Design a protein around this ligand. Structure first.
Ligand code: FE
Ligand code: FE
Ligand code: MG
Lengths: 151, 149
């Protein structure tokens, strides 16, 4: 079935424990490994959403926030680049490789890209990722944020 | 006070029309000028309309309006509207008395540098239930705090 999680929101630390423990339980996700993006929902209810992501080298989230959702990421196989925006334009880039995880609160703005072909990652959000902010730049250079429904 | 409007969220052109219409009807807002101090002119399921009196120190900070379109009419004085540019050389526009502007729901801006005693009318649709307020670390990494209002 779906995952058997608490009936409440999880904080950042709890979300990071969740994605790491799921990674140690391939019975919960191996079936859903599928390469195109391709994402597969492992769990979606009123408190938490969990997705399994299978990456191609070209895949790119764009710059986004998660509105009011905290989140965590565990890389199961391969490696991703987590990028954080800086107003100067010299953005911070970190490689996250197999075995590693990180979490963030709801104020986070980031971009995931640069994956090794075939990478696999588990992403959890609490409260659920029902809204995402997608940033874009005009030819002027002026930045905008489009709020998108993900429910 | 109730406003004769379509029973639906309004677009940015409709909101600009609204703020300019209200600016032409001082009988509706003149009583509420007070020196941002703010007075609600009308709030319902579809729109929020505010009168704002500015001091020279007032500053919204950088923010978005989540899913709300908006419009501003400067009734007296002047405001600076600024729009952020990657690179740090932000676009700045002085909006003087008599002038108005509107924007869709993707806008990021900051209002500040008001002549002392400026008066403006602001309308949002859908209502401004949530705002995103941007901040930096001393590292320089930008964050967005979602504020319920
Ligand atoms: Fe994300
Ligand atoms: Fe605003
Ligand atoms: Mg165990």
């Amino acid at each position: 079935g779906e995952l058997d999680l608490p009936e409440r929101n999880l904080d950042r630390r709890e979300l990071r424990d969740l994605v790491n423990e799921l990674a140690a339980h391939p019975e919960r996700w191996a079936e859903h490994v599928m390469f195109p993006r391709h994402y597969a929902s492992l769990h979606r209810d009123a408190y938490v959403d969990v997705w399994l992501l299978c990456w191609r080298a070209e895949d790119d989230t764009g710059w986004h926030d998660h509105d009011i959702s905290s989140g965590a990421v565990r890389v199961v196989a391969g490696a991703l680049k987590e990028c954080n925006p800086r107003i100067g334009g010299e953005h911070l880039e970190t490689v996250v490789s197999e075995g590693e995880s990180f979490s963030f609160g709801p104020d986070h703005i980031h971009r995931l890209t640069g994956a090794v072909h075939g990478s696999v990652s588990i992403h959890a959000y609490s409260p659920p990722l029902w809204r995402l902010g997608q940033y874009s730049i005009d030819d002027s250079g002026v930045m905008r944020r489009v709020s998108v429904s993900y429910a």
